[PDB]
Design an enzyme around this catalytic site. Structure first.
Site, PDB file in Angstrom:
ATOM      1  N   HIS A  61     -31.098  13.553 -16.197  1.00  0.00           N
ATOM      2  CA  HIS A  61     -30.082  13.870 -15.261  1.00  0.00           C
ATOM      3  C   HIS A  61     -30.502  15.057 -14.357  1.00  0.00           C
ATOM      4  CE1 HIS A  61     -28.547  15.724 -19.071  1.00  0.00           C
ATOM      5  NE2 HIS A  61     -28.366  16.881 -18.329  1.00  0.00           N
ATOM      6  N   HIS A  91     -31.716  24.960 -14.243  1.00  0.00           N
ATOM      7  CA  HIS A  91     -31.839  23.643 -13.674  1.00  0.00           C
ATOM      8  C   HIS A  91     -31.193  23.708 -12.264  1.00  0.00           C
ATOM      9  CE1 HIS A  91     -27.967  23.485 -15.642  1.00  0.00           C
ATOM     10  NE2 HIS A  91     -27.562  22.851 -14.562  1.00  0.00           N
ATOM     11  N   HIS A  93     -29.223  21.071  -9.062  1.00  0.00           N
ATOM     12  CA  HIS A  93     -28.505  19.881  -8.636  1.00  0.00           C
ATOM     13  C   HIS A  93     -28.882  19.731  -7.163  1.00  0.00           C
ATOM     14  CE1 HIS A  93     -25.757  19.716 -12.145  1.00  0.00           C
ATOM     15  NE2 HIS A  93     -26.064  21.072 -12.235  1.00  0.00           N
ATOM     16  N   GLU A 103     -22.941  21.918  -5.900  1.00  0.00           N
ATOM     17  CA  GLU A 103     -21.735  21.536  -6.682  1.00  0.00           C
ATOM     18  C   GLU A 103     -20.557  22.364  -6.186  1.00  0.00           C
ATOM     19  OE1 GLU A 103     -22.910  21.419 -10.943  1.00  0.00           O
ATOM     20  OE2 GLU A 103     -22.760  19.232 -10.476  1.00  0.00           O
ATOM     21  N   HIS A 116     -28.589  26.699 -11.305  1.00  0.00           N
ATOM     22  CA  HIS A 116     -27.805  27.169 -12.393  1.00  0.00           C
ATOM     23  C   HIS A 116     -28.639  27.867 -13.469  1.00  0.00           C
ATOM     24  CE1 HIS A 116     -24.517  24.126 -11.295  1.00  0.00           C
ATOM     25  NE2 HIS A 116     -24.373  25.202 -10.582  1.00  0.00           N
ATOM     26  N   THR A 195     -20.669  21.503 -15.708  1.00  0.00           N
ATOM     27  CA  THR A 195     -20.460  20.469 -14.679  1.00  0.00           C
ATOM     28  C   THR A 195     -20.987  19.063 -15.078  1.00  0.00           C
ATOM     29  OG1 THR A 195     -22.355  20.947 -13.451  1.00  0.00           O
ATOM     30  CG2 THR A 195     -20.384  22.272 -12.936  1.00  0.00           C
TER      31      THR A 195
HETATM   32 ZN   LIG Z   1     -25.804  22.718 -13.482  1.00  0.00          ZN
END
Ligand SMILES: [Zn+2]
Ligand SMILES: [Hg+2]
Length: 256
Positions: A61, A91, A93, A103, A116, A195
């Site tokens: 992911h 990580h 996104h 996000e 994050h 999240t």
């Molecule tokens: Zn995250």
């Protein structure tokens, strides 16, 4: 299981994870005119000089960079926090396009990606324990915008080739996270959640006001990752972000 597809995306997570429609879900839209300036807010204290990176892995992911959290090597303190929080992993996104990927949003503005840095509260002894407390985690969120290359990110970018599919990992020592921080440590803070499933409501969010810039080539490389496992049909790892959630009474405080 869960993903970011048509049949298993964010709109479906509630079915397996009821807390998806809980009281303190993340991310949210940060309305800068509604945020409360809190003068009682202390400066953040980031102590990453003795950080110990171990490896990088494609979990299907996102890609996680992991750190040795057996001692107070890389910690976060001050700001809205009480106690010391140890860095465990970072990580990102990211989106399929530069106009999306983050996000959190700022006045409904979407950034290209979001970093994050995840930390757990040391009074709880271990990560597993900290995810049982309402003040278990502290996540440091940093927006990325496309412009000039970020020198300090180059090391991560060059190793993505080696962890292209789900389940692949690589030795990733001697990586200094300090290269990913913006100049200013001004922030917004609010009580939220993870999240991604399990969407646990244990996070104190500290989102930095100042975005970092990365080059088009750098974010391009993120987009070449795969959600799938080796020997499986190729599904590009893009748009692995969750849409903003209802603020529901919470108050966003600003350090500035
Ligand atoms: Zn995250
Ligand atoms: Hg919790």
């Amino acid at each position: 299981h869960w993903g970011y597809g048509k049949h298993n995306g964010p709109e479906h997570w509630h079915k397996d994870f009821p807390i998806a429609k809980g009281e303190r879900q993340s991310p949210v839209d940060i309305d800068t005119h509604t945020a409360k300036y809190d003068p009682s807010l202390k400066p953040l204290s980031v102590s990453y000089d003795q950080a110990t990176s171990l490896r990088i892995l494609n979990n299907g992911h996102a890609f996680n960079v992991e750190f040795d959290d057996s001692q107070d090597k890389a910690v976060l303190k001050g700001g809205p926090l009480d106690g010391t929080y140890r860095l465990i992993q970072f990580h990102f996104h990211w989106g399929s396009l530069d106009g999306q990927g983050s996000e959190h949003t700022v006045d409904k503005k979407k950034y290209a990606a979001e970093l994050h840095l995840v930390h757990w509260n040391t009074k709880y002894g271990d990560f597993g324990k900290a995810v049982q407390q309402p003040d278990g985690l502290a996540v440091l969120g940093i927006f990325l915008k496309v412009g000039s290359a970020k020198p300090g990110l180059q090391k991560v970018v060059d190793v993505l080739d080696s962890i292209k599919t789900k389940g692949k990992s690589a030795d990733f020592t001697n990586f200094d996270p300090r290269g990913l921080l913006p100049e200013s440590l001004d922030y917004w803070t609010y009580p939220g959640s993870l999240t991604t499933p399990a969407l646990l409501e244990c996070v104190t969010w500290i989102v930095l006001k100042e975005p970092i810039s990365v080059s088009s080539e750098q974010v391009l490389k993120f987009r070449k990752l795969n959600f799938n496992g080796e020997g499986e049909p190729e599904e590009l790892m893009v748009d692995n972000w969750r849409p903003a959630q209802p603020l529901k009474n919470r108050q966003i405080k600003a350090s500035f």
